[PDB]
Amino acid sequence: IHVVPKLPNSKALLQNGVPNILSSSGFKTVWFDYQRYLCDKLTLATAGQSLESYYPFHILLKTAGNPLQSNIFNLASSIHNNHLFVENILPSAVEHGTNSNAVVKTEPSRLFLSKIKDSFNGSDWEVVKEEMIYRAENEVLGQGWLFLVENNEKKLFILTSNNNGTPYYFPRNQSFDLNSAISIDEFATLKQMKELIGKSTKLNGKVQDWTMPIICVNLWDHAYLHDYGVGNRSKYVKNVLDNLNWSVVNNRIFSGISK
């Protein structure tokens, strides 16, 4: 079986919560119910199936082809996306010093400053904050998430993650709204993708795209409809985008070397 991961100092969250973002409530209809519902739904799908011994994130990637497994895959990605989402929306206050952390949160990290500068052509990250809201509002018709995404092109770009798309596997990002007719130009990208992947896995290799996601903002009903409301979908994104613990984002960029 899998185990919904305990949140840092959920002790507060149980009745308290993430300053500004949410008090208790929220995660009650997300981490402590929604997450479990599908975490179990997967654990129930994984039953009797190798897909389980491995973390669902591994499965998320594994369940790429054989679309007949998408059911499990979509849920799987949601499982993965949500924790990434919680991490972004994680208060993750620092400990020690006894006295409650003075939240000297390192804002856009030094590296992040340059990352966006190149990502959006000499533009400010905070500028992107609302640009992001613009994109999300005009890249979703129902459920989904928001996702800053670093690429092998070190353009730390942002992807139009939808419902529960794969923030990594380009062939399954779920960006084009097949429901909403798309301009022939997006179809050009579709044509490319048909060809691009058609030959990548052609030698047993799903496009090895290191499209690593960075900042996740759930756009599922639970994300906004649960509490903030309907027209507040964007408004909910507002406070979230207003402040994001950077400790995680600081460690979401291949910034240094190792072995």
Partner: protein
């Protein structure tokens, strides 16, 4: 922005017959319409007079209507879905517990007693139609809730008749030709729903031949030279020898909406805890105002 897109049975400040909480319908309809009809006005003014169908049927995929189409389809479906209801006779629900294992309880109905039925609502002929078009209303009842359970985002399960009385009737000038269905089928509409047929070639060849007719011009210098469709020779058949046909027979794909059901968190999350979709649909099937569907039922050959 007038309550034209509404029926009094859907009342403001009304906990939709328990099914929805006092503000449940606000958060699944009234407050939803707020932003919804707002964007509709932002999109255009024909909304004041022309129904959503107009803008929608105005264009399969307008480069501009893109966003407009979404707002249009949503409210249209809301109407088709909310209208066929009548309020299940149960008190406002509690937080369906850690279901999943707690769910799948009783018997996901498969051959175990049907409840609110066309028969129970004196919709006898349609009751037979449903048996004849879905194994048996039991087998029909089975798929409905399940299909909606399948949804993982904002989507709507639908029941139709896909009338195929005969090709050529509008040019034959048959205004009194109340569409005459041949069978009854189920289809779903997510984010923004369209008849169905995965609009196979509805948008396929139209975007497809687009890039491919260009393929020859795309090679601006000449045309990739002798080497022709090649990897796309059999692939141009993507629709040419296939989806062109997959467009259903010979260009006559049309569906007849009768019973439709939303599968958006907003509709169930409200009172049906975090996963009561099934209980939501349970109350739903037990809240279907059939008469409207029999009223929504065209005659058959």
């Amino acid at each position: 922005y007038s309550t034209r897109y509404a029926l009094e049975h859907l009342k403001e400040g009304a906990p939709l017959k328990g099914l929805f909480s006092i503000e449940g319908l606000q958060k699944a309809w009234f407050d939803r319409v707020k932003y919804l009809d707002a964007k509709l006005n932002d999109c255009t003014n024909e909304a004041q007079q022309k129904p959503l169908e107009t803008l929608i049927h105005e264009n399969s995929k307008s480069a501009s209507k893109k966003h407009i189409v979404n707002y249009a389809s949503s409210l249209y479906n809301l109407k088709f879905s909310m209208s066929s209801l009548q309020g299940c006779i149960r008190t406002p629900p509690e937080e369906c517990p850690r279901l999943g294992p707690e769910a799948l309880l009783q018997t996901p109905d498969f051959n175990r007693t049907i409840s609110n039925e066309p028969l129970t609502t004196g919709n006898e002929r349609l009751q037979a139609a449903l048996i004849s078009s879905f194994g048996s209303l039991m087998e029909f009842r089975t798929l409905l809730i399940n299909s909606n359970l399948a949804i993982s985002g904002d989507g709507f399960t639908w029941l139709v008749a896909r009338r195929q009385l005969d090709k050529r009737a509008m040019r034959n000038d048959m205004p009194n030709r109340d569409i005459e269905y041949d069978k009854l089928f189920i289809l779903n509409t997510y984010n923004a729903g369209t008849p169905f047929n995965f609009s196979t070639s509805g948008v396929m060849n139209e975007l497809n031949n687009q890039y491919t007719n260009m393929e020859k011009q795309r090679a601006k210098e000449a045309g990739n030279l002798e080497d022709s469709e090649m990897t796309a020779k059999q692939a141009k058949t993507k629709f040419i020898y296939e989806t062109q046909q997959k467009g259903f027979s010979g260009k006559e794909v049309s569906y007849i909406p009768l019973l439709a059901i939303d599968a958006s968190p907003k509709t169930w999350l409200t009172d049906y805890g975090v996963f009561g979709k099934r209980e939501y649909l349970e109350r739903v099937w037990d809240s279907i105002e059939w008469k409207i569907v029999e009223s929504r039922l065209p005659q058959r050959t």
